[PDB]
Structure 1
Amino acid sequence: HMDKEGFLNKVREAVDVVKLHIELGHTIRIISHRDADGITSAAILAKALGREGASFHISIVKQVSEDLLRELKDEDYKIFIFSDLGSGSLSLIKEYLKEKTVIILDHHPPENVKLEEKHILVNPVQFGANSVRDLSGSGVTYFFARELNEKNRDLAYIAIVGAVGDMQENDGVFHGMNLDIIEDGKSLGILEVKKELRLFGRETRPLYQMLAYATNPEIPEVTGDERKAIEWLKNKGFNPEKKYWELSEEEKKKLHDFLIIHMIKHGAGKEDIDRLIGDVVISPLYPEGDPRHEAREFATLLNATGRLNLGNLGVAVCLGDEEAFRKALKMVEDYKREQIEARKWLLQNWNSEVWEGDHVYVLYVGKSIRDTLVGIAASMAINAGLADPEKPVIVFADTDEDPNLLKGSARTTERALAKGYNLGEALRKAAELVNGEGGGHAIAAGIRIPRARLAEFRKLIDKILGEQVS
């Protein structure tokens, strides 16, 4: 449970100080995250401020680094808006942006420091929200836009695209104020919530690829084998080359039955079965078979643009630019190819490269897996059975822009959270002793450390994770 009225009041506070700069004609400096949640957040801001005639300059970056801020203070603008980032760096924000106004529309757990009055923090977790379940970066941006203007309710589907991108329904259903965003889109007719297969490929992928690409959760003896998916689908009575949206409601229900019975016969956990069929958000504003018709395929299209340093193009895709959509459509196939090869490399090199301690797996891939896929790689290590569900997994890779730095993402399960693990506070406390930058949610966190201190990090992160148990 969260205080929705208290958080809404803090939203009204940020809206009031933003209208302060809109009246004077100030250009809003928008810094957003490269993830699909961040791309949607920048698109919601661009449309909301556009309805007010305000000027804005959007930059889609990977993280709020120390190097970003000292280049950002000497810019030109008088107000800055951080969407889907900034909560784990407001200590550095009130130092480098002390002489500027800063708005932070983020949902990450924020480090507890006192903020300057010209820096308004709008974070739902300060009002009782779950960091990975109640609201995402696009959700904070949506409520910020909806308070600035009620007409911004037509951005409810774009906000849900970001929530599915951040996997805010990973347990199979939506929670928190995401349901309030859904009810806004339902009253406008731009959004429908079905109970379908929560797998990528509802619109553009054949049914056998949808089953073979399933990594969250995995379908036993079918994930990674398109041939066995073709055969299993056929002797159950389904055309493998048909699309899931081309299935009738009778075929979908029958498909769900065979899939659940399959997971049960092969010993899949109840939690994976419960999250296989759940909330799937569609939008009648788009044709069926188009990836924008479903939220997960929309977010995958947005992640394909941010993967190639083209997040601004994905922002135009959300806004309705059809030429940017045709260019974005040519980026997803290689994005899915690199995910499959990340899982291929994972299954082959796990038992020979992983560093297993008393409370963590630490896998260093070097350059075999790109730095923006270590989060997906850490989750794939858990869903493939390579790692114990109660022991977190951290995957490191060489940073794209600097070889002397390592990008790491930590993922774990809800069962390990019941034991006392807090990946966000563990990586934040570890990064302090490594000259690095850490932080994130209790179930998912990211860290950037120098490559030289890797062996020391493995020892410290295992001790730190061992302290927060009990």
Structure 2
Amino acid sequence: SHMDKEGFLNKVREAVDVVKLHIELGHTIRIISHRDADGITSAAILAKALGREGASFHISIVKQVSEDLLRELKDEDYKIFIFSALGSGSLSLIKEYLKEKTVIILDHHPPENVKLEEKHILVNPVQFGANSVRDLSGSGVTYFFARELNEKNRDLAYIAIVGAVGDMQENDGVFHGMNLDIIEDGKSLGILEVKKELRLFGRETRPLYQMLAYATNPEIPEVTGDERKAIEWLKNKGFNPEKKYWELSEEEKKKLHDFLIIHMIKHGAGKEDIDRLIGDVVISPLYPEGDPRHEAREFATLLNATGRLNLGNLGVAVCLGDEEAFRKALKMVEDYKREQIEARKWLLQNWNSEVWEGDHVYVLYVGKSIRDTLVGIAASMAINAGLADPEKPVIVFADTDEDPNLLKGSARTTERALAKGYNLGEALRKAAELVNGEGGGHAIAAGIRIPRARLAEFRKLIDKILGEQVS
């Protein structure tokens, strides 16, 4: 991909001029953001930037943009609404319910192909040639929005990268697009640094054997999910398994990298998984070593842990420096990682007996066996554990926490399937229209909410829609 970076920044300037019209008049800025790391960092960037301009703001951290949400926002008396890290897939609904309000969309998902009214400004790098999952995240769009508003907001560069890491925008091992420009801004201020290290969770707070056993993207053969074998392997290679990765010297890290690469080669791992095991890791000298805020992936996991318990507002406070909010949030990470471990064990046990395999898709309905906010991780795990054909997309459904008759689904696939022509966001958007649902997202990763009554109909429908995308 090749962005028109200046054309995108010109659009950012247009949105900044609009929001300053309302700041001048003392209008309270209504902010709607997503509950994962990309949305939480986005909300904190807006909260800090708008605080620097003396503006007032009201933040709501939500699970998605829905028609039910927009009907609630229609009755709110705010003059301007800012959607961050979401909203691109709901332009028609935003046009309908917020017609007489000013709306700013700071997002990176493929936008719905509809025209907007003059007071609804879409700020999306995809419209300027960006790859939606590599070149910039929602926190990155919000960062450049904040930077154009005030140059001092460059000190939010690390927070913006935390959201990009939460969105796995360095999933192939390196950063791309305007994420590299954010990194340069943070390096100029000395608030972040890019290392070439093991790209796994647990650099700061986990012992080495849990860092290896937790690895699911990519998995480490025979070691993933088995802390006892991880301990044996580390000791056999001359490492203290209880030591943390940050406590290793640079010489020991390189020795660990060599052993892991040899291990994956000996067990037949693919080249793409080997090449992304070691790569860009962003750390921040603003925080001490051993603190999860010191590394972007641990920081993002910490924020996701707060949003998992409907406490994303606590995660926003952590980004803004609330140390008491940090002390609470730190106690939420362990149960978050444990639930992912149990989710993988449930997948390995029940995939064969429960999965619905069509000609172009896997559809797995877990009921409540996996939390609805974890179906995206579950779908990726099925691919990364070898349960699913890499060229066949995986959709995992779970009952929503709020409505047992409503399902939340996440679709995930690989680059090999994208080469076949599959586009999960486009397919889910079309299928949702036919079963009274709401769906959309990236070509490689998308989500959908449908009534539980429509599950059997949806499986036949999405299999047909995906099959027609095949080039």
Q: TM-score, normalised by structure 1?
A: 1.00
- Give the share of equivalent positions with the same residue, in percent: 100
1:70-126 deviation digits (Å, cap 9, x = unpaired): 110111210000000000001000110001000000000011111010000000000
Distance 2:322 2:455 in 1: 44
Residues 20-50 of structure 1, C-alpha deviation per residue, up to 9 Å, x if partnerless? 0000000000000001000000000000000
- 1:268-289 CA-to-partner distances (Å, cap 9, x unmatched) read 0001001100000000000000
Aligned-residue Cα RMSD (Å) equals: 0.4
1:208-258: CA deviation from partner (whole Å, max 9, x where unpaired): 000000000000000010010000000101000000000000000000000
Deviations along 1:4-31, one digit per CA (max 9) or x if unpaired, are: 0000000000000000000000000000
| Distance of 1:223 and 1:280 partners within structure 2 | 21
Deviations 1:349-379 (CA, angstroms, capped at 9, x unpaired)? 0000000011110000001001000000000
Quote the offset at 1:440 in angstroms. Answer: 0.2
Distance in 1, matches of 2:342 and 2:247, equals 29
Secondary structure of 2:290's counterpart equals coil
Pairwise CA distance, 1:380: 0.2
Deviation string 1:281-311 (CA, Å, 9 cap, x unpaired) is: 0000000000000000000000000000000
- CA displacement at 1:466 relative to structure 2: 0.5
Secondary structure, in 3 states, of the residue corresponding to 2:407?
strand
SS in 1 for 2:88: coil
After superposition, the C-alpha distances for 1:378-427 in whole angstroms (9 at most, x for unaligned) are 00000000001111000000011001110000000001100100001011
Q: Distance in 1 between matches of 2:391 and 2:253?
A: 33
* 1:380 and 2:381 matched: yes
Measure, in 2, the Cα distance between the counterparts of 1:22 and 1:467: 48
SS at 1:40 equivalent = helix
Does the residue aligned with 1:183 lie in a helix, a strand or coil? helix
> For 1:458 and 1:90, how far apart are their aligned partners in 2?
26
SS of the residue 1:205 aligns to: coil
Q: CA deviation at 1:145?
A: 0.1
Partner SS, residue 377 of structure 2:
helix
- Distance in 2, Cα, partners of 1:253 & 1:214: 18
Aligned equivalent of 2:191: 190
Structure 2 stretches of 5 or more lacking a match? Answer: none
Question: Does residue 1:200 correspond to 2:217, yes or no?
Answer: no
2:246 & 2:131 partners in 1: Cα distance? 32
- Cα distance, 1:198 vs. partner? 0.3
Write the distance in 2 (CA, Å) between the matches of 1:363 and 1:111. Answer: 27
CA distance in 1: counterparts of 2:132 and 2:311, whole angstroms? 27
- What corresponds to 1:62 in structure 2? 63
In the alignment, the residues of structure 2 paired with residue 362 and residue 142 of structure 1 have an alpha-carbon distance, to the nearest angstrom, of 36
Distance in 1, matches of 2:403 and 2:264, equals 43
Residue 407 of structure 1: SS of its match in structure 2?
strand
Mapped to 2, the partners of 1:109 and 1:150 lie a distance apart of 28
User: What do the CA deviations read for 1:45-76 (whole angstroms, capped 9, x no partner)?
Assistant: 00000000000010000001100011101112
Q: Distance in 1 between matches of 2:252 and 2:277?
A: 16
> How far apart in 1 are the matches of 2:95 and 2:355?
39
SS in 2 for 1:406: strand
Q: CA deviation at 1:335?
A: 0.4
Residues matched between the structures, number: 470
Deviation per CA, 1:136-167, whole angstroms, max 9, x where unpaired?
Answer: 00000000000000100000000000000010
Equivalent residue of 1:31, what SS?
Answer: strand
- In 2, Cα distance between the equivalents of 1:111 and 1:227? 48
Give the SS at the match of 1:458.
Answer: helix
Q: Give CA deviations for 1:410-456 in whole Å, capped at 9, x if unaligned.
A: 00000110010000101111111111001000000000001011001
Report the counterpart of residue 149 of structure 2 in structure 1: 148
TM-score, with normalisation over the residues of structure 2?
Answer: 1.00
Q: Which runs of 4+ in 1 moved over 4 A?
A: none
The 2-side partners of 1:466 and 1:313 are apart by 43
Separation in 2, partners of 1:410, 1:97: 29
Q: Partner of 1:230 in structure 2? A: 231
| Aligned-residue offset at 1:127 | 0.1
SS in 2 for 1:403: coil
Q: What is the CA-CA distance between 1:316 and the residue it aligns to?
A: 0.3
